[PDB]
């Protein structure tokens, strides 16, 4: 798998080992998830680039 | 300067009271705009920046 510099939101469980990650670059919803810094964001009309 | 002119009525020493009576309807006026709401706009990041 190719490696590129990316900003990844990281969710850590009780162990602290990474379990869930979000790629901000791929998908509009993922950019919204990076915003608010929450895995799920409240439903709203959100502008995109 | 012409702001020193006031409409006046005369007090009566006698128990009977002098008064001024309106005789003309003279209708018609306009009311100030209340503004109520402001224009809603969102800047787009990665475009304006």
């Amino acid at each position: 798998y190719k490696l590129q510099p990316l900003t990844f939101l990281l969710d850590f469980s009780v162990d602290g080992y990474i379990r869930r990650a979000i790629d901000c670059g791929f998908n509009d919803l993922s950019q919204l998830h990076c915003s608010y810094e929450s895995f799920d964001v409240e439903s709203g009309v959100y502008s995109v680039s | 300067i012409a702001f020193n002119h006031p409409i006046q009525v005369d007090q009566l020493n006698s128990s009977y009271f002098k008064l001024s009576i309106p005789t003309n309807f003279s209708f018609g006026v306009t009311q100030e705009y209340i503004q109520t709401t402001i224009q809603k706009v969102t800047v787009d990041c990665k475009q304006y920046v």
Side-chain angles (χ1 to χ4, degrees), chain B residues 29-37 39-45:
Chain B
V29 84
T30 181
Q31 191 69 13
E32 76 283 334
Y33 144 92
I34 345 192
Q35 199 267 353
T36 84
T37 180
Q39 181 191 13
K40 43 173 59 181
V41 48
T42 186
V43 89
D44 186 33
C45 294

Side-chain angles (χ1 to χ4, degrees), chain A residues 37 42 46-47:
Chain A
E37 288 285 326
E42 306 297 325
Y46 296 116
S47 297

Side-chain angles (χ1 to χ4, degrees), chain A residues 4-10 12-27 29:
Chain A
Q4 35 270 325
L6 274 170
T7 314
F8 265 39
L9 186 138
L10 300 181
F12 307 96
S13 294
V14 190
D15 56 356
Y17 285 93
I18 174 70
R19 287 294 170 261
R20 281 191 52 183
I22 301 183
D23 179 18
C24 299
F26 184 58
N27 293 352
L29 292 325

Side-chain angles (χ1 to χ4, degrees), chain B residues 8-28:
Chain B
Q8 287 213 6
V9 57
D10 187 29
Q11 189 176 332
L12 192 49
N13 191 26
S14 173
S15 62
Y16 305 126
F17 36 85
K18 304 170 69 168
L19 48 87
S20 299
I21 185 176
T23 71
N24 300 332
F25 304 102
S26 309
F27 293 127

